[PDB]
Amino acid sequence: NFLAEQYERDRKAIINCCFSRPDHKTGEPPNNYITHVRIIEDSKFPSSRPPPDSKLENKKKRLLILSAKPNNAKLIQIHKARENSDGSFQIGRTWQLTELVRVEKDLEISEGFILTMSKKYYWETNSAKERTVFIKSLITLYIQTFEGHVPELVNWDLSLFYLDERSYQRAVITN
Amino acid sequence: ANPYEGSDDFVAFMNKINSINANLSRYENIINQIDAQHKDLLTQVSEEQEMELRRSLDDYISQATDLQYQLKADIKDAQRDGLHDSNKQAQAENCRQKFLKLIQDYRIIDSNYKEESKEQAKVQARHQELLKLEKTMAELTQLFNDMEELVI
């Protein structure tokens, strides 16, 4: 199982670099790692579906990482990171989970999805399964974190998140 | 946590599934009645009838907690019996998904009632109600996680 073993190696490296030691300059406890996924980011088209003619040099390998504040399981953060040659990771951006307002499945690209937080971000997983697995983790985390609320969901099977039509209408943040 | 991985035997197993499906129906009705009593409280009810409505709500909440405990045990047991049979595992997992959706139904129903209580209010007994609601939602979250744990 390549995807399972890659997950085990990635998770151990992520926790080791970035979610186990006290803060470098502040001494705060580290965040608690929750999950992650590998993503492809197009540097020229980061907020929309990239065209097929997009140069291959535009494609960047990044990771999305979810974590919780050390003294508040209700404060979730999303981190984007890149992988260093030694096996460690460098976080380049952090969002608070309260920024997630819209999550859309790309109907045309089987690995594509769009998160609306600070703005719209287009990303691709490496496989359709990895999109299903990560978005499930993300929406499940949100519904649990914000006690019965859910961002706007576009083109998803609601049953993936244990919702149906009218449970989604009661829970969606747009009210 | 790696997300990337009755004498006849089948008649006996399906007796478990039939029993689970009956309690899932009981669970769904109890949640349905909890939602209804929330809507009753959200109408302006005389102080006498209001407390009879609160004790009935308390009774239904306790029934749900005990049904949840029984549904967890019975579903995880059906998952064990299916650890070596494709048909049994499909049956048990189907029951697990039904359970999780109802737990999600309950969690959303309590969330709507929590937010609608404040937007209708603005004594200290209202604070004890919020602590009871937060207790239940912590349990539903804890129960949600127990049901996602693998059975081995």
Residue numbers in the entry:
A (entry chain A): 76 to 250
B (entry chain B): 4 to 8, 33 to 149, 197 to 226
Paper text:
Recently, we crystallized another complex of the two proteins using a longer version of Sso2 (aa1–270), which contains all Sso2 sequence except for its C-terminal transmembrane part, together with a shorter Sec3 PH domain (aa75–260). Diffraction data to 2.19 Å resolution was collected at the ESRF synchrotron site and the crystal structure was determined by the molecular replacement method. The final model contains two copies of the Sso2/Sec3 complex per asymmetric unit, together with 418 ordered water molecules. One of the complexes contains residues 4–8, 33–149, and 197–226 of Sso2 and residues 76–250 of Sec3; the other contains residues 6–14, 33–148, and 196–226 of Sso2 and residues 76–250 of Sec3. Our crystal structure of this Sec3/Sso2 complex reveals a previously unknown binding site for Sec3 on Sso2 in addition to the one on its four-helix bundle as reported in our previous work. This extra binding site is located at the N-terminal end of Sso2 and consists of two highly conserved NPY (i.e. Asn-Pro-Tyr) motifs. The NPY motifs are connected to the highly conserved helical core of Sso2 via a non-conserved linker with variable lengths (roughly 15–40 residues), which is invisible in our crystal structure, suggesting that it is mobile within the crystal structure. In the two heterodimeric complexes present in the crystal structure, the two NPY motifs of the two Sso2 molecules bind individually to a similar conserved hydrophobic pocket on the two Sec3 molecules. Particularly, the tyrosine residues in both cases (i.e. Y7 and Y13) are docked into a conserved hydrophobic pocket on the concave surface on Sec3. Overall, the NPY motif adopts a T-shaped conformation, with its broad top part shaped by the asparagine (N) and the proline (P) residues, which is stabilized by a hydrogen bond between the carboxyl group of the asparagine and the amide proton of the proline.
The final step of exocytosis in yeast involves the assembly of two t-SNAREs, Sso1/2 and Sec9, with the v-SNARE, Snc1/2, on secretory vesicles. The exocytic vesicle-docking site in yeast is marked by the octameric exocyst complex, which belongs to the CATCHR family of multi-subunit tethering proteins. Our previous work showed that one of the exocyst components, Sec3, promotes SNARE assembly by interacting with the t-SNARE Sso2. Like syntaxin-1 and other related t-SNAREs, Sso2 consists of four helices, with the first three (Habc) forming an inhibitory domain and the last (H3) serving as the SNARE motif that interacts with the other two SNAREs during membrane fusion.
